[model samples]
Target: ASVQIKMGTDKYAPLYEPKALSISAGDTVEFVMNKVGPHNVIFDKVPAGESAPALSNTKLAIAPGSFYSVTLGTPGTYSFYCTPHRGAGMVGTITVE
Candidate 1:
């Protein structure tokens, strides 16, 4: 199964749409840049027994309509942020079951 999160921005803040998501293990989470950006998602923390996915660790750069995705392998919370906007509160969480 798959889910998509849009890396969007509000006039007041840079943010991730659907700040949190829950999914079964092995499901894919796709981070798509639906608005203009130089955004990227880099895993900040992952549950024990699971390292950040390679695609995420590399901080896949995003332009409008492009994406970076990960198939979670372990059941737990995963945290991430946009490198450029992290301080602007652009962050998100994913809970894997």
Candidate 2:
């Protein structure tokens, strides 16, 4: 009972309101920030050698109630995006059970 996934949205702006999600292990992934500006949530992929905590977006400046979060405890399926829009996809995901 701890999972939300919202992102900048003018109905036709940056993405990821629910690109795909499912939660369990150590539950916590609440990415909320409505209205496009600068954005981020980059888990940035790392499976073999670890060190991709890559989570940023706390005052990149675009003011829509600014946000950023991280609370993990091991379970895979980590791939995120939004650093400069990543080709305008602003990706996201979840699969922690």
Candidate 3:
């Protein structure tokens, strides 16, 4: 199966934006980072630094109309945040169902 999630560099895309998504064991979760700026699709649930630990250590310094993708290998509530914009409440999650 396949799922699509959206990210807004300037603001929150929507409550259903699915910054965090849910999929089956073998499903693929596509994180489409929209807009521009130094943002990230991170999965750092625990407190650390600017970076999230649960994430794949990937940051998306995207330009307008750019995108990135990742496939889930586990089943759970995955926490994520945008690197630069995260401080402004730019956070989200993905669940592997």
Clashing pairs in 1: none
User: Candidate 2, residues 1-97: lDDT per residue as tens digits?
Assistant: 4777777567758887778777766877787777676665665674533345644443454666636555665666666667766788878776666
When summed lDDT is taken over every stretch of 10 residues in candidate 3, the lowest stretch is 46-55
Give the per-residue lDDT of model 1 (tens digit) for 4-80: 87787555356887789888989999877856466887878786768765446545465466576668779899888
For model 2, give the 10-residue run with minimal summed lDDT: 49-58
lDDT of each: 0.75, 0.66, 0.58
TM-score computed on alpha carbons, candidate 1: 0.82
Question: Which candidate achieves the best TM-score against the true structure?
Answer: 1
By the lDDT metric, which is better: model 2 or model 3?
A: 2
Clashing pairs in 3: 20-93, 20-94, 21-94
Top-down lDDT ranking: 1, 2, 3
In order of TM-score, best first, we have 1, 3, 2
Pairs of residues clashing in candidate 2: none
**TM-score of each prediction:** 0.82, 0.29, 0.67
